[PDB]
Amino acid sequence: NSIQIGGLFPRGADQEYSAFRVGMVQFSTSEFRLTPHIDNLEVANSFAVTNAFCSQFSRGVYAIFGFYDKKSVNTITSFCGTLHVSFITPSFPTDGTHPFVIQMRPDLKGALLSLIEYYQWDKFAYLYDSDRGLSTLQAVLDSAAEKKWQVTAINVGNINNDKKDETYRSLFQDLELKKERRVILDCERDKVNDIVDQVITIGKHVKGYHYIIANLGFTDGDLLKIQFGGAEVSGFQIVDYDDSLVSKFIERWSTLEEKEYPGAHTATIKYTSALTYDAVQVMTEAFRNLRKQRIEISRRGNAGDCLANPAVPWGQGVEIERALKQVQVEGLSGNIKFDQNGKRINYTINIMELKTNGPRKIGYWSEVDKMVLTEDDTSGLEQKTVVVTTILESPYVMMKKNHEMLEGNERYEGYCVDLAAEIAKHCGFKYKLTIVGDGKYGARDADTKIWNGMVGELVYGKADIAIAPLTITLVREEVIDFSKPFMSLGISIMIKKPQKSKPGVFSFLDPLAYEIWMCIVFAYIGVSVVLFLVSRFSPYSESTNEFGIFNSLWFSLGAFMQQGCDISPRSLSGRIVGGVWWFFTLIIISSYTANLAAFLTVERMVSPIESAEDLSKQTEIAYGTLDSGSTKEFFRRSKIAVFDKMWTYMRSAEPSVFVRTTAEGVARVRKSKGKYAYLLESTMNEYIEQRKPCDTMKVGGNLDSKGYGIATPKGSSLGTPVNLAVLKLSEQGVLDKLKNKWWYDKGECGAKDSGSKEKTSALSLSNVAGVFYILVGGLGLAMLVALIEFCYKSRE
Amino acid sequence: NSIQIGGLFPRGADQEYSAFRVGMVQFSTSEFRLTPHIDNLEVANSFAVTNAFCSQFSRGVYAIFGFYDKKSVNTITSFCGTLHVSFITPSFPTDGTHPFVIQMRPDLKGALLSLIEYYQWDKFAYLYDSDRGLSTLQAVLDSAAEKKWQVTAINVGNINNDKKDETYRSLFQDLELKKERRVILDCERDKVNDIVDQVITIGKHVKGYHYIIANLGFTDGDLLKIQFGGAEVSGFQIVDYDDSLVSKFIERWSTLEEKEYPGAHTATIKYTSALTYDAVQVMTEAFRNLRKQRIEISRRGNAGDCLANPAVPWGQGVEIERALKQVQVEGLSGNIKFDQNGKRINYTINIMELKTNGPRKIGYWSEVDKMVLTEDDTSGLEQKTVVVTTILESPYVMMKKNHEMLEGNERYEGYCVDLAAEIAKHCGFKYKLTIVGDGKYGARDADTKIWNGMVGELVYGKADIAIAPLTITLVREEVIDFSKPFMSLGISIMIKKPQKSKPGVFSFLDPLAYEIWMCIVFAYIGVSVVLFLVSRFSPYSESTNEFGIFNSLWFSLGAFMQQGCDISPRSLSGRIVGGVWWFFTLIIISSYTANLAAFLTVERMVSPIESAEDLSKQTEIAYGTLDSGSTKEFFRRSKIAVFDKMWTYMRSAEPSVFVRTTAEGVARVRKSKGKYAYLLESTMNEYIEQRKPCDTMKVGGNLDSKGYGIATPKGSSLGTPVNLAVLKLSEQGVLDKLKNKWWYDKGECGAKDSGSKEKTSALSLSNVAGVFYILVGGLGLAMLVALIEFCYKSRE
Ligand SMILES: CC1=NN=C(c2ccc(N)cc2)c2cc3c(cc2C1)OCO3
Ligand SMILES: CC1=NN=C(c2ccc(N)cc2)c2cc3c(cc2C1)OCO3
Ligand SMILES: CC1=NN=C(c2ccc(N)cc2)c2cc3c(cc2C1)OCO3
Ligand SMILES: CC1=NN=C(c2ccc(N)cc2)c2cc3c(cc2C1)OCO3
């Protein structure tokens, strides 16, 4: 016996009925075929829906296919659950777990929330039409409360379409007042078409806008209107046309007679009619399985008009409902399986984007995994992070303290790190920072043609790029491509900061200079001799004055040292000598004390090297450079006279003046107590000078001029994008901001600012220790002279 | 009598033919009738045009109305010139002078260039169609060469009906390679519609784009679809529907049956049909005038064919041509006149813009006056200006060096003035800098209620806004209102910078302080007395030493002066006295010379006063404020103890310490040479302190916290917008930039650090002049003592 089924189609659903008849033709079999009796109803009218439902129920219908609306979901559910009559529908799923309702439409709320999370949306509008229920609006509000979103929900279904359908222009100005560029269209195809028309009219389909079409019919709309505006349009598709079943259906679908099959003869199919076809498949499979299980469900050709008291449900409905539940098939809408409540499970919803060349899939969504990308256009060349070989040193690449759990790009900070970050941001590639295995910047080995590991790994591609403190030079640039310099500097000489001068034993002579002391002694002898000669050549008895040669010497000594003698000249010429010597000693003593006072104030005495010219002349202070660095190669090939002199020294030095690392050079400078100097680039020298301790400074006038560049292996396609990005950074001045941050904002060396002033201390015994030694020596000498006299008269 | 005329109507010119028939009905008359013979043909085919022309000539057509194209203009012009047959056309005007061609379409090149130069365009794209001639393109290129425009001319018409594709997108992305937001559409209605459709499709109709529809049919096309995009759309209109005659025509045209007259039953008509109607008017007026002149217009029998050898013309053609030329009427397209070449003159082109509410006229263009604005709906809205009141103050409102010829606001400067006048620009007029009439910030007269110049002018409405160094205070808030203060300030005290202290007569005593000198004298007497006591009470027999009281005094004086004595104590107690006095004198002399050295090296300034209390405590210093400025009100209002003391002084002070102007106060400070002090706002104190000469300084902290604001009469509508503008400027931080530019960046008197001392220079006689006076006085005293002794023994 033929299975009598019922059809409840909405008015104007021509395509749905055409797909229904197509499914009836396709799934008809030799043993039997379903015989539907259909009525066309205004599904929004519950009274008409009930009339049709009871007309079919009294007709002997075993299962009712059809549609419902927000105004008729409840009556359909209640009648089906009370009379135990199964309802297979492609309309929107019921909010609750309603029995005897087979729901062919998958749940969209989870897919919509996952897609919103994928784009990392927090602020967005949610334009909804209430014709399919507010379940998705409730879901987005609940998930906004949970996830801290800001959702502006606007109801567009209240527009009085009976008269006009134009209030959207005033609607979108509210979004303009809220600066909402991200909008969700929870509407069916007609309403989303109207929204898109008004969006285009007011010019909001342009770059910067993003629309999500919150329905399973992304391609069923007129997407071509908004395709070229530049705004992102994305949505969900249940009918993935790139499949065997859908393609086989559509090749016949496009060739059906349009008058016989209204809505057919098109390259695309509305998802509602696709679900209608899949529902026909499901229910015919269910009935064939029921017969295959030898289950009989026949009943008499009359019913209780839905209004018998009490209700009289047949018993075999549970069997039919279970058969419908356990049906699992493959169809146009993907895998089809229902849980015990009729909700579809194991389904897949495709996520698509509307690009300039058309709408195409970007991934899919499933009940077991959320928002899985399609993995199309697979990687293999540019998804791998590039290997950046750099070197470790304080101003550019540092080891961060909490290295026990930090990762490759988080373990390191500095100028190189953030410059690489900015260059990658402009070029659009991902990266990892690695240290150079050789631990040195590398240079060619002379006469042996041996290269360090950097050249081999660059050739092999293991060293993808070298964003590192590497200097521009001709020898390297013919072997590896170099970008435009981001910093200009040169080689500088770095010496230990001199300490305060330590007084010597004979430092009491310091204020007045050696030649002045020589001439003071000579003037003393001359004054004494002239005084004696004046006083004693016949002045007309002899010895009328005490001024013999020895007494003249004693008087001259007393006058210099400002100790009044026991005798004074009484002649004119002798008094002339005395007065001029007195003037001399007054000026000299005043000069000594005034000079000493000047020196005891005002610090900062002497400096070892001034312009690296004296460095090349003097031989006590040994000086060297980094080994295998650019500076050493600079000194080899420099034909400048002073630079050639410096190279001829540095090559022939008996001890090793070179060091492997910059830290080793700084440690050698600090350890070698001022008699070593290290030639290193200006920037690192400034950084070390500003760091603590401040025991080293920069001297010399920036010997040469060189620039830092990002190294690239020869012929690499990455050479020009990094070159243009570095030029962009140089012209925009962000490099200057990084320079300020990493050098000028960390001037921790307060001694350079010279903001503090010391207090003069008491003179130490060391400052005048020499006069004590001269005093004791003279006392001993006097005793010795006295004893001699007594003995004589007693007988990069 | 009837006159036969010809018709050259393109196939598809249905509205043109309908307007022709309507004009023939309307301008019909009983005295004579026009008999049209009409051929419909492809005007782009010269063969068809010429064969129709010859067919119409063969039947003695008096004058030929019709249209032509770029491919057929020359045929018409040549045949009309050779056969002396007049041609009346609404088509594009001929590129040069041509007889027997009456042209109804006004020239657009001048209007287009005027509209371009009104928007101050200098870089725009020019999209042109070839079907209407390249004369406009040539004029644009010539004017661009003359005026240095950048014109990107693109031949949109090159993609003809055979090359029919949606390739405009490639064109518009080509324009995006140059950032060309300004586009001119030199195309007819159809091509303009296609361009606008593609513009809307790819989102080029958004705000920031501006289009000039370069044709006389701005409003006859479909402008509605681009109306709401936000992009500016402007054009030209020859038919003004607000005119009486045009309205009378359209109120009958719109009601006429469209089935009988194609293109009728519309609220608007294409301008070409309007020119067809006016051409019928002109032709019938010309023939009426010919009849009124009784010209023998009867034709000489058979006209013959075109290809006559020689092509002898008929003589009536020149009379007919002149009659057509000298017709002057008013019709749908405004006033109608023709020059000797047939080009229309005295015409008016309406300039229109596409607003959100529809296209509207913004002006009109004529041969005599070019691009005159209509001022309708713009000349709306006491004073038509904003008379900003300022006060001449150096940091805020200076007088320009070129005051003898500068005019307007350029005579002064102001940033906040023009930011506040942005609101006036929104109102629709510029700002005018004006100096306050009484030159004072203004204050209420106490107990008399007499109103100051500001008191009246900012409440009578004579000044609708005031920008000045006018300070916020409570007394003014009850009568006027202020915006948020835009800078901070405080009342501060300004005094003359002290000069270097010149030495006094007795400045040689300065290093050691008065108490030390007193105690030195007392210690001298004590030491001398004790020495005499220990050396002269009975040693056992007295007179064994020379140390009497006078000799003891002499020895102690010599020991202090470090001048050798003649006697020495020669006893234990006496030598104890001597040694302790020697130690005293060593320390004292060293201290004197060391402190003198310290003073002569470092110069300190120490201002006479340091705080507000110093002014209150010091009575000699005369200090005052500006009269009528907010500072004087602050001193009355203040109940603070120190400020109440200051006011109780200044109120009952010596001859008036107040001044009228800031310049007067500064001149008083500089003139008083130290003993005057001026209390005024700090900002002017830093300004004047940084200016030359720097003989003034700011001393002490700010007496209070105050601020300037924008003044406004009570309840005026400008208050809220200027308050919002000030708050926005404060948030934008431009006020800080202005502060830096006007105060910090000037500098010119920057203070030096603790170093950079000037050279010491020699010690002047004044520094030691008093010691000379004491020496000479002592010498005179010694002479006096000696003479006395000789005389005695001689007998805002
Ligand atoms: C480290 C120094 N400190 N002491 C003395 C010095 C000399 C004398 C006395 N009484 C105390 C201290 C000195 C003086 C100078 C000078 C260098 C020195 C060396 O150059 C210019 O005069
Ligand atoms: C460049 C000179 N430097 N030395 C002396 C000078 C004077 C005396 C002695 N014993 C040594 C040196 C000098 C001193 C001055 C002066 C200018 C000079 C000239 O103005 C203020 O005192
Ligand atoms: C303008 C000054 N200039 N001369 C002397 C002064 C004293 C003695 C000699 N020989 C030269 C100059 C002075 C010294 C001072 C002092 C103020 C002055 C006044 O305060 C601390 O010691
Ligand atoms: C605050 C003091 N100020 N005065 C003396 C001092 C010493 C002697 C005389 N006659 C006057 C004043 C002083 C001198 C110093 C010193 C610390 C002081 C302490 O360290 C370097 O020499």
Numbering used by the authors:
A (entry chain B), B (entry chain D): 10 to 549, 565 to 819, 1301
Show me the paper's own sentences about this structure.
Excitatory neurotransmission is principally mediated by α-amino-3-hydroxy-5-methyl-4-isoxazolepropionic acid (AMPA)-subtype ionotropic glutamate receptors (AMPARs). AMPARs couple extracellular binding of Glu to ion flux across the postsynaptic membrane through their ligand-binding domains (LBDs) that are directly coupled to transmembrane (TM) helices that form the cation channel. We used cryo-electron microscopy to capture AMPARs bound to glutamate, while a negative allosteric modulator, GYKI-52466, and positive allosteric modulator, cyclothiazide, compete for control of the AMPARs. GYKI-52466 binds in the ion channel collar and inhibits AMPARs by decoupling the ligand-binding domains from the ion channel.
In the first scheme (inhibited state 1, GluA2-γ2IS-1), we mixed the CTZ-bound receptors with Glu and GYKI-52466 immediately before freezing. Each approach resulted in similar inhibited states, with each domain in the structures only varying by a root-mean-square deviation (r.m.s.d.) of 0.3–0.4 Å. We focus our analysis on GluA2-γ2IS-1 because of the higher data quality. To resolve GYKI-52466 binding, we used symmetry expansion on the AMPAR TMD from GluA2-γ2IS-1 to reconstruct the binding site to 2.2 Å resolution. GYKI-52466 is partially stabilized in the collar through a π-bond stack where GYKI-52466 is sandwiched between Phe623 at the top of the M3 helix and Pro520 on the pre-M1 helix. Van der Waals forces from five nearby residues, Ser516, Asn619, Ser615, Tyr616 and Asn791, also contribute to the binding site. In GluA2-γ2IS-1, we measured the distances between the Cα atoms of Ser741 (D1 separation) and Ser635 (D2 separation). The D1 interface is markedly separated (27 Å) compared to the D2 interface (16 Å). In contrast to the LBD layer, the GluA2-γ2IS-1 TMD is markedly like the desensitized AMPAR TMD (r.m.s.d. = 0.7 Å). Next, we measured the ion channel radius, which indicates a closed channel; the upper channel gate, defined by Met629 at the M3 helix crossing, completely restricts channel access (<1.0 Å radius) to both water molecules and sodium ions.
